[PDB]
Write a protein that binds this ligand. Structure first.
Ligand code: CDL
Ligand code: PC7
Ligand code: PC7
Ligand code: PGT
Ligand code: PGT
Ligand code: PGT
Ligand code: 3PH
Ligand code: HEM
Ligand code: HEM
Ligand code: HEM
Ligand code: UQ5
Ligand code: UQ5
Ligand code: FES
Lengths: 64, 57, 244, 387, 179, 28, 69
């Protein structure tokens, strides 16, 4: 059917609104090139660290 | 404990035999109890609980 | 650079074999082994695992015997002096996808798919790491580009892995009808790999519980023994001439 | 009395030496549990020797077979997993017990006269332990093994003129290879026996004068026989240690280790993080705090020089920290500094850890620099604190 | 008496010796169990490993050899002697007293087809491998301690107690054996 | 007449210890 | 060299005394004694370790933030 991990990842987003907004702000700030050295790896990592922490306790309950 | 003393502690040979018997029987009893706890804590997860065991085509 | 070099940290998942009295989930081990032999084995070796290892863990003896018979193992030399082929037996190790490490690198763009026999013990937070890596393929952060032949995975150190995403939905079919979503196969294959790295785990935990309980009883007895022997000294009354 | 007849078998010539050195040996009645760690270390040594003898029955010291022979010990020989986890975590238990032993000696100034030779033999024993454990860690032939062997054999290159020849003589070639592993195996079987002999000499030197005590005073007025009192006390200690060791063996067998050594040695790629076992980390930190090859090796040697010179410092006549507030505080600071050095050794070599490591190394050497000043000044305490 | 560490029983109370011994025996149980466990773990670590036990059973087929000769074939460290005995050899192996034999056995109960003898070629004395066409009985002579075997692989003189072991062999056709 | 009783007691102890180390229940 | 002592010692048989109850007797006084005499030592051992650890984490966090675009 539908993979529970992606569904949980989408349902856990309201707990990670602050890192998500910060990552979006970083993307907007680097939409200009500056020789292709700017990136948003740290903010990306913060957002996914929050999402993974939210998802992990609940994933294995939906798995067998 | 003085009655048990008059049967088991009067001679060191009987006492040593008692210690050996206690080691044997107590280790067996503890093993049994630990295995009971293990089985009660892991219901459904054993090899013998594989639904399709014997059914690989 | 700074954070991508070490990678994203993996979460903590509640594995069924975690706990001082918790065993492996053996049906999950069997499902994980089918995932392995249907997806992983075409590129990863498991040189430490024999077919006999599965007997009494995930398969009956006849099941593993037929499994081994399905494969072609080299043997010899015969009386004439030539190498030949024979059906696999219970004592054979799992087959190698490639003839040597150089062949593996040549088939995988210069990268060597590591042997997975001890991979959960060969990485920090191994089980969680493997699960997160397998289910953690996604788009790179803005401003990060990946060269051709590599795939972005934030869990992998550096973020660029030579493995393509392989745990795609319904990539396997399960004998018990378990729906084979990406997360389900990830959990099952990690269960199988964790059993492979530590097949003695259940015996080890049973031994540990038993002997720690017994040694605690022994410690109580030892304390009583020591204090019994020392009480004549500790409660003694000492009279001496001196004052200051 | 005239010994015409036979009294206790303990006093017969068959058993008299054992009796007088292990049963009737006079011991200060006020020894605390901090005095059981010598017996604990002896038990750890016997455990290591027994498990290693049985493991050598199944281990193959060849680069093509060593990793596989370990794995075969873990998977194939019955109780092999237990034998390996016992040897690998028994090395850690040995070092924990010996470190506690050493810091007991430091706190109560057990190194002071007349026990200087005891302390020097202990320092020699510590060096032997370090070498033994390191070459043992090379034997599995994982990534950690290969790269640690590389750097430790390279240490000899700090010598300007003959350093390279010593490195290549230690290797048996131009690189760490099968010759290195095979010679490291022989040394690993041998050094434990020399450790046993050194420990016996340590014990004999200690029985020249008897053990020091928590008060640090002359104890001849209140001594009691080792058997049974300190036997049963050490037995309490042995059972507690057994519980501790069993927790490590059965439930956390790999927490005191790095997963890199489960990867077979690859001479092409150094792992991103390359550290020794935890019990070597403080020495690692002192080594890396010097931004110079020869300086680092010289600091490593100066650590043991200071340890050896400690008993010969002109000191005050007061031993125990219980009556020396300043030295007691300095001891606790030294313990914190050593723990910090261990933690720093586990960190990558970058800011802020270079500065922290440098300051910690300085503090560690300041302990040994300041103790003699403390002794010289405190010599004047009885003349300045009058009743 | 000082009472900071221990409080006395009332004076004249019965001694607690029996209770003390009973309590100590409980920990003595554990000490004995621990010692037994550790020793047996070392003894059994020397026993055959799982990889060794996994290679203790198989079958191999064979063919035919000319009469009067012997071929030494393999298995898992136990070589097998196969000899095509001539009619004179069969007659010589059937004219001996059973009572004189150290191990009482008959020729027929050791052979299926009287034209072939298939035995395991390990001396029953101490594991050495007897030499073909040697000894003073026309069979096998063991070079280790001088064990002598006859045409039927039966011990006649020497230290070995038993005759040569007979495996499970059969004939699928005229020139096909199998073990 | 106590040395014989001591020998019998220690023989019982030795037998009990033998059955305990080796535990030959599957062989008897 | 033997010491010359003058003393009188009275002792009670081990089987005439309670063996274990003295472990949990005046426990609060024991805790007070341990804390009151050893708080300086515990401070000297713990404060450098925790302070250095906290400063290192603070430095790492600020350095990571400074390199972020
Ligand atoms: C290693 C042993 C582990 C335990 C160490 C405890 C220390 C000790 O008791 O001395 C060593 C003790 C005796 O050795 P020793 O030779 O006499 O040496 C003494 C030392 O010098 C020490 O002598 P000491 O006089 O200097 O100190 C004695 C100790 C005191 O030693 C004790 O621990 C004894 C007290 C606990 C025993 C109480 C038993 C219960 C009975 C209570 C009384 C009931 C009255 C009857 C009522 C009937 C109904 C009316 O005092 C301490 O301060 C120890 C530091 C710990 C204090 C912190 C905890 C205090 C309690 C909390 C505050 C109180 C509020 C409680 C509220 C609830 C909190 C949960 O060793 C043991 O007793 C062995 C214990 C065996 C336990 C089983 C195995 C445990 C490990 C399992 C591992 C599993 C994984
Ligand atoms: C890494 C592995 C390597 C080992 C690291 C650990 C090293 C530890 C070394 C310990 C030092 C050994 C020397 C012992 C001498 C000190 C001692 O025994 O206690 C001190 C004092 O001990 C201390 O000050 C310890 C300070 C540090 C304690 C901080 C750790 C927290 C412990 C609390 C328990 C856990 C609570 C957790 C939170 C609830 C008092 O000793 P005395 O001078 O002989 O006086 C005896 C007392 N009496 C007067 C009654 C006769
Ligand atoms: C078939 C017969 C039984 C066979 C087993 C014989 C051995 C049994 C083991 C002993 C069990 C009894 C343990 C003591 C019970 C009393 C508990 C108690 O009150 O604590 C005692 C002290 O006892 C202890 O310290 C506990 C020591 C127990 C030792 C651990 C027993 C080990 C069990 C072995 C079982 C076999 C399994 C293991 C096999 C390998 C208090 O001593 P005092 O302070 O001097 O007196 C206090 C005053 N008042 C009486 C009023 C309270
Ligand atoms: C490397 C590991 C670290 C150290 C580990 C510990 C080392 C050993 C353990 C600590 C020392 C234990 C030594 C135990 C000996 C006790 C001897 C004893 O109790 O003697 C009994 C007697 O047992 C004997 O030892 C006698 C036979 C000795 C034969 C040799 C009791 O006799 P008694 O004192 O009443 O006098 C009677 C007389 O001796 C009888 O002749
Ligand atoms: C003071 C008493 C005498 C000395 C004993 C010392 C005890 C004090 C504690 C000392 C420190 C213990 C080791 C510290 C680190 C251990 C924790 C760790 O490293 O993690 C491991 C986990 O650590 C533990 O599991 C702790 C186990 C403790 C044993 C408890 C079982 C008790 C059994 C008998 C009951 C005793 C009751 C006595 C009653 C009288 C690994 O976890 P995992 O997720 O990888 O695996 C999951 C699985 O559960 C572990 O195998
Ligand atoms: C690893 C090396 C570290 C290097 C450190 C850098 C240089 C610093 C070297 C000095 C050591 C730092 C720690 C010294 C202070 C220790 C704490 C202390 O001593 O305070 C005492 C307080 O009294 C003092 O000692 C203060 C004295 C100040 C120093 C005065 C110097 C004159 C004396 C010179 C004598 C020199 C020899 C002294 C030998 C002891 C403790 O009082 P108390 O425990 O008896 O009871 C009070 C408490 O509330 C309950 O426990
Ligand atoms: C001494 C303290 C050791 C620390 C553990 C406490 C004693 C043992 C109970 C462990 C409980 C546990 O987490 O797993 C058991 C387990 C709960 O863990 P679960 O597998 O996650 O449910 O429960 C049981 O199987 C029954 C309880 C164990 C027996 C208790 C005896 C006292
Ligand atoms: C479910 C199936 C698979 C699993 C569970 C699996 C598992 C793993 C693991 C644990 C690693 C180690 C990553 C690391 O070093 O941290 C890895 C790496 C790798 N895998 Fe697999 N694997 C699978 C299938 C495949 C397939 C099908 C291929 C090739 C088509 C492949 C090729 C590789 C390569 C090339 C690497 C090394 C990548 C690099 O170092 O950049 N794997 N895999
Ligand atoms: C004569 C006595 C000894 C023998 C025969 C011996 C033998 C061995 C053998 C065969 C190995 C390789 C197998 C393995 O890795 O588990 C090994 C590893 C090791 N030995 Fe020993 N050993 C002895 C004493 C010691 C002592 C006294 C120490 C500590 C000072 C020690 C520390 C080690 C260490 C740390 C390892 C590496 C363990 C690992 O990670 O697997 N050994 N020893
Ligand atoms: C294999 C390692 C060692 C063993 C088996 C051992 C054994 C012992 C034993 C049994 C004692 C007497 C009981 C005790 O005080 O605990 C002792 C005391 C002592 N040891 Fe060691 N030891 C070892 C390592 C060391 C080291 C590394 C040092 C110092 C660098 C050292 C220094 C001392 C001192 C100073 C004493 C006298 C303690 C006192 O009187 O208070 N030992 N040792
Ligand atoms: C990343 O780097 C590092 C490692 O790596 C992971 C390490 O592990 C360690 C750990 C090493 C320490 C603490 C010191 C080791 C010290 C010594 C003295 C070992 C040297 C001895 C060897 C190699 C064998 C001795 C050889 C002999 C006696 C030859 C025999 C000859 C005859 C009998 C004639 C450190 C410091 C390190 O920085
Ligand atoms: C006053 O007296 C006593 C002490 O207080 C100072 C003690 O500290 C101890 C306890 C501690 C001891 C004796 C530690 C000894 C440690 C050593 C030497 C480490 C290794 C031990 C071995 C191998 C023993 C070597 C001895 C011999 C004779 C070799 C043969 C032995 C065997 C085959 C096992 C005891 C028993 C003691 O009574
Ligand atoms: S082995 Fe044949 S006679 Fe000795």
């Amino acid at each position: 059917v539908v993979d529970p991990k992606k569904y949980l990842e989408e349902s856990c987003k309201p707990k990670c609104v602050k890192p998500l907004l910060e990552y979006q702000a970083c993307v907007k700030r680097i939409q200009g090139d500056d020789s292709g050295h700017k990136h948003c790896t740290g903010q990306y990592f913060d957002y996914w660290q929050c999402i993974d922490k939210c998802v992990a306790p609940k994933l294995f309950a939906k798995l067998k | 404990f003085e009655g048990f003393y008059k049967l088991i502690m009067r001679r060191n040979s009987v006492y040593v035999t008692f210690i050996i018997a206690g080691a044997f029987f107590g280790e067996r009893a503890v093993d049994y109890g630990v295995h009971k706890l293990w089985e009660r804590n892991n219901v459904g997860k054993r090899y013998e609980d594989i639904s399709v065991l014997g059914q690989r085509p | 650079a700074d954070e991508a070099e070490h990678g994203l940290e993996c979460p903590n998942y509640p594995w069924p074999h975690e706990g001082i009295l918790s065993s492996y989930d053996h049906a999950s081990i069997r499902r994980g082994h089918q995932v392995y032999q249907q997806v992983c084995a075409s590129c990863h070796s498991m040189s430490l695992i024999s077919y006999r290892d599965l007997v009494g863990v995930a398969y009956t003896e006849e099941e593993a015997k037929a499994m081994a018979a399905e494969i072609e193992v080299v043997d010899g030399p015969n009386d004439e002096g030539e190498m030949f082929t024979r059906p696999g037996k219970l004592s054979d190790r799992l087959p190698e996808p490639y003839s040597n490490e150089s062949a593996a690198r040549f088939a995988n763009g210069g990268a060597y798919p590591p042997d997975l026999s001890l991979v959960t013990k060969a990485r920090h937070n191994g089980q969680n790491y493997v699960f997160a890596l397998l289910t953690g393929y996604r788009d790179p952060p803005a401003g990060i580009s990946i060269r051709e032949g590599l795939h972005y995975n934030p869990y992998f150190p550096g973020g660029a892995i030579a493995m393509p995403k392989m745990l795609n939905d319904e990539a396997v079919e399960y004998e018990d009808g378990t729906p084979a979503t990406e997360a389900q196969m990830g959990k099952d294959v990690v269960s199988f790999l964790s059993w492979a790295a530590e097949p003695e785990m259940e015996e080890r935990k049973l031994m540990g519980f038993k002997w720690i309980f017994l040694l605690s009883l022994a410690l109580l007895q030892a304390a009583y023994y020591r204090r019994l022997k020392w009480s004549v000294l500790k409660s003694r009354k000492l009279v001496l001439d001196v004052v200051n | 009395t005239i010994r015409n007849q036979r009294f206790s078998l303990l006093k017969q010539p068959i058993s008299s030496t054992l009796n007088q050195h292990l049963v009737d040996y006079p011991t200060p009645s006020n020894l605390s549990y901090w005095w059981g760690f010598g017996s604990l270390a002896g038990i750890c040594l016997v455990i290591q020797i027994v498990t290693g003898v049985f493991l050598a029955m199944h281990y193959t010291p060849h680069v093509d077979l060593a990793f596989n022979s370990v794995e075969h010990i873990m998977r194939d020989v019955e109780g092999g997993w237990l034998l390996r986890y016992m040897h690998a975590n028994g090395a850690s238990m040995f070092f924990i017990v010996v470190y506690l032993h050493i810091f007991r000696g430091l706190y109560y100034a057990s190194y002071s006269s007349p026990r200087e030779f005891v302390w020097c033999l202990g320092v020699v024993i510590f060096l032997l332990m370090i070498v033994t454990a390191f070459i043992g860690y090379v034997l599995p032939w994982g990534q950690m093994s290969f790269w640690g062997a590389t750097v430790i054999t390279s240490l000899a290159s700090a010598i300007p003129v003959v350093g390279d020849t010593i490195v290549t003589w230690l290797w048996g070639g131009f690189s760490v290879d099968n010759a290195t592993l095979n010679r490291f195996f022989s040394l690993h079987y041998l050094l434990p026996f020399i450790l046993v002999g050194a420990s016996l000499l340590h014990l004999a030197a200690l029985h020249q004068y008897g053990s020091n005590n928590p008060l640090g005073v002359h104890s001849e007025m209140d001594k009691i026989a080792f058997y049974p009192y300190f036997y049963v006390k050490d037995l309490v200690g042995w059972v507690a240690f057994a519980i501790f060791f069993s927790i490590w063996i059965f439930y956390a067998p790999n927490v005191l280790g790095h997963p890199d050594n489960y990867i077979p040695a690859n001479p092409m790629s150094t792992p991103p993080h390359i550290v020794p076992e935890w019990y070597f980390l403080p020495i690692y930190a002192i080594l890396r705090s010097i931004p110079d090859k020869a300086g680092g090796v010289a600091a490593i040697a100066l650590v043991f020089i200071c340890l050896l010179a400690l008993p010969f410092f002109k000191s005050m006549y007061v031993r125990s920290s219980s009556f020396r507030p300043i030295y007691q505080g300095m001891f606790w600071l030294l313990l914190a500094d050593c723990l910090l050095l261990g933690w720093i050794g586990c960190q990558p070599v970058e800011a802020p850890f270079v500065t922290i490591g440098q300051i910690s190394s300085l503090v560690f050497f300041l302990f040994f620099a300041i103790t003699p000043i403390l002794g010289r000044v405190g010599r004047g305490i009885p003349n300045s604190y009058t009743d | 008496y000082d009472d900071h560490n221990h409080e006395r029983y009332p004076p004249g109370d019965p001694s607690k010796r029996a209770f003390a011994y009973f309590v100590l025996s409980g920990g003595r149980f554990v000490y004995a169990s621990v010692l037994r466990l550790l020793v047996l773990k070392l003894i059994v670590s020397m026993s055959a490993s799982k990889d060794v036990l996994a290679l203790a059973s198989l079958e191999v087929d064979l063919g035919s050899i000319e009469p009067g000769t012997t071929v030494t074939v393999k298995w898992r460290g136990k070589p097998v002697f196969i000899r095509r005995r001539t009619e004179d050899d069969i007659k010589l192996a059937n004219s001996v007293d059973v009572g004189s034999l150290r191990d009482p056995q008959e020729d027929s109960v050791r052979v299926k087809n009287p034209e072939w003898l298939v035995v395991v070629g390990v001396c029953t004395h101490l594991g050495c491998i007897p030499l073909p066409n040697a000894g003073d009985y026309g069979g096998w002579f063991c070079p280790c301690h001088g064990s002598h075997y006859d045409i039927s692989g039966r011990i006649r003189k020497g230290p070995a107690p038993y005759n040569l072991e007979v495996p499970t062999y059969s004939f699928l056709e005229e020139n096909k054996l199998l073990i | 007449t106590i040395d014989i009783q001591a020998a019998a007691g220690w023989g019982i102890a030795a037998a009990a210890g033998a059955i305990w180390v080796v535990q030959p229940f599957g062989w008897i | 060299q033997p010491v010359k002592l003058k003393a009188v010692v009275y002792a009670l048989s081990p089987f005439q005394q309670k063996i274990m109850t003295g472990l949990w007797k005046d426990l609060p006084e024991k805790i007070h004694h341990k804390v009151s005499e050893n708080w300086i030592s515990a401070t000297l051992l713990v404060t450098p370790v925790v302070g250095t650890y906290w400063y290192a984490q603070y430095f790492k966090e600020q350095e990571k933030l400074e390199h972020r675009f």
